[PDB]
Amino acid sequence: RNLAALEAKISEAKTKKNMLQARAKAAKANAELQQTLGGLGTSSATSA
Amino acid sequence: RNLAALEAKISEAKTKKNMLQARAKAAKANAELQQTLGGLGTSSATSA
């Protein structure tokens, strides 16, 4: 029974962290996309 | 939507500057023509 319970802990603990890490990485990737769209620098040509 | 908007900015920003630059270059070219017509130097023969 300890092994059966231990297996459940390992499986859920492993998978939940991975997906959390994946989505967290996805989150920053989306945020970077929004930041870059605002960070477009072609407006600097006004000096020219 | 950010990409679609960003594309519009790039296209208009690029083309408007180019035409502005072209006409600006054209403007000075026309002005030079008028200046040169007044700057004709054949009148210096009066000394001869």
UniProtKB/Swiss-Prot annotation, chains A, B:
Q: What happens when the gene is disrupted?
A: Essential, it cannot be completely disrupted. Cells with very low levels of protein have no ordered thylakoids, are barely green and are non-photosynthetic.
User: Where are the membrane-spanning stretches?
Assistant: none
- This protein's source sits in the domain of life called Bacteria
Cellular localization per UniProt: Cell inner membrane
Briefly, what is this protein's role?
A: Required for thylakoid formation.
UniProt similarity note: Belongs to the PspA/Vipp/IM30 family.
The name this protein carries in UniProt is: Membrane-associated protein Vipp1
Species, as recorded? Synechocystis sp. (strain ATCC 27184 / PCC 6803 / Kazusa)
User: According to the entry, what is the taxonomic lineage of the organism?
Assistant: Bacteria, Bacillati, Cyanobacteriota, Cyanophyceae, Synechococcales
